[model samples]
Target: MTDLVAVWDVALSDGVHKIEFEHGTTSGKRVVYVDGKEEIRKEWMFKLVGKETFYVGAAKTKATINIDAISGFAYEYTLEINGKSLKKYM
Candidate 1:
């Protein structure tokens, strides 16, 4: 069980956007750490292809998502927000 980390700066916006997780993952729970502190910890089962909303003044810049799988082997995570992709790591 390898751990994967995806980091990005939350873009400042007036409208609400989402952080969507899709493709190649098996787990349900994901932990989001913002500025080295835990900010999101909940059941991510429905987020296999689902998303979470993010509005202005509601998110941090230096955010990191800790996923419980690596790239390849049905675990390549496509991280996107506001209809734009950020990155994918192994």
Candidate 2:
């Protein structure tokens, strides 16, 4: 399978951050960088294929419908924080 590269850059109460996910392989990798530092990473197989909501950090940081409709994957998400809603497929 080919790698599906995705990236998200947003601003929250804490500051600017980036979340990157690389899919479409035997195993997947996800990383969250906060303020230029690697903060989170995940390795998995056949996970995160469906719609899901994830909340991280005390500022109600969220990733909503960030990736979807890719091959066998699908998703639907509506997440709002700090008076703003996170756009889908970001």
Candidate 3:
């Protein structure tokens, strides 16, 4: 396990003109400090669909027990250029 140290979020510029739905990526990288000496890094990618819904998941390079194998549904979008930022609520 690692200790979470800092979080940074960035939104890429994307826009839609005539589509019925909106889409885009809200993604960033996180750095973790373990035992106050070791550093662990992780990447997060999230997408927005329509105006109010989304899905997210995580990945690891090392093999670990699959949560979905037991839990079933490891349940796992984009936006327009003029879309608003979700950060306002965070």
Candidate 4:
């Protein structure tokens, strides 16, 4: 029952957003939280690699989590906001 989490803080024209994600390998499930609220959730996902998108701030900036595959049943978590990396956006 091991799980992992990755978080982010994004600033848009409307406001600053606190984003949180729940990702675990064994269960192949995912969740997305924005501004302390659960905006998106999939309880019983069977796929290990896929994509989930979420919006940030009142202006609704684009945000996506790319669950890409790797070696040894491993997957990579990457954040793409407005077609750019968070680091570049900031």
Candidate 5:
């Protein structure tokens, strides 16, 4: 199943960017979309915990999607840009 987990809006030097992230806990699938464009896609992950790093926007900013297990089968996701969390970065 396609699990739409989180969506974030980020204002950058160029313009505002929309990020859409999806994860399937049971299948360990990951998909990252930026500004209506598919950037990274992965399937059949051995474990549900890991990180996906990609660029966003014309400047090609550094962004990372952190996948961490909070508890048994529970996961936490956070997006970081330029080595800083979205909260701290913006």
Candidate 6:
């Protein structure tokens, strides 16, 4: 596996959520359109060692996935909510 890669979360049609730590961190969620139903939420934590190298941790487990496997990320939350929300206490 290439150490330098981009990370992304992928969802399979069979409801298999893969938190791919190829180059970054991504959280996966199942989305439905027929009835606008969704469930089974999961988040993948990632540690970026370099530009494209990252370590992933989630579901009470940790692992390393190369960046070559990354397709694309859905959402990227790179902010601290509690303190940042006020934007007054720096």
In every candidate, how many clashes are there? 0, 0, 9, 0, 0, 7
Candidate with better TM-score, 3 vs 6 = 3
Model 1 CA RMSD to the hidden true structure, in angstroms: 7.2
lDDT of 2 by residue, 1-90 (tens): 124355556677777666543444356454444444545556565765543355545675765434445434544233444556553442
lDDT of 5 by residue, 1-90 (tens): 258888889888789999988888788789999998889888778787788999899999889888776646567788998666742110
Best by TM-score: 5
lDDT of 6 by residue, 1-90 (tens): 222122234322334333322222333222211112222222333542212212222232222222122225332222121122111110
Stretches of candidate 4 off by over 4 Å are 86-90
What would the per-residue lDDT of candidate 3 be over residues 18-46, giving only the tens digit for each residue? 11111112342333322233233335534
Better of 2 and 4 by TM-score: 4
Top candidate, metric lDDT: 5
lDDT of 6: 0.24
Candidate 4 local lDDT, 5-45, one digit each (tens): 56777777886888877776677778888887887778776
Query: Which 10-residue window of candidate 4 scores lowest in summed lDDT?
Result: 81-90
Would you estimate the TM-scores of all the predictions?
Answer: 0.41, 0.45, 0.18, 0.79, 0.86, 0.17
C-alpha lDDT values of all predictions: 0.43, 0.49, 0.23, 0.72, 0.81, 0.24
State residue 11's C-alpha deviation in candidate 2, in Å: 1.1
Q: Rank the candidates by lDDT, best first.
A: 5, 4, 2, 1, 6, 3
lDDT of 5: 0.81
Please tell me which model should have the higher TM-score, number 1 or number 2: 2
Error of 1 at 13 (Å): 4.3
Candidate 5 lDDT for residue 73 = 56
lDDT (Cα) of model 1: 0.43
Better of 1 and 3 by lDDT: 1
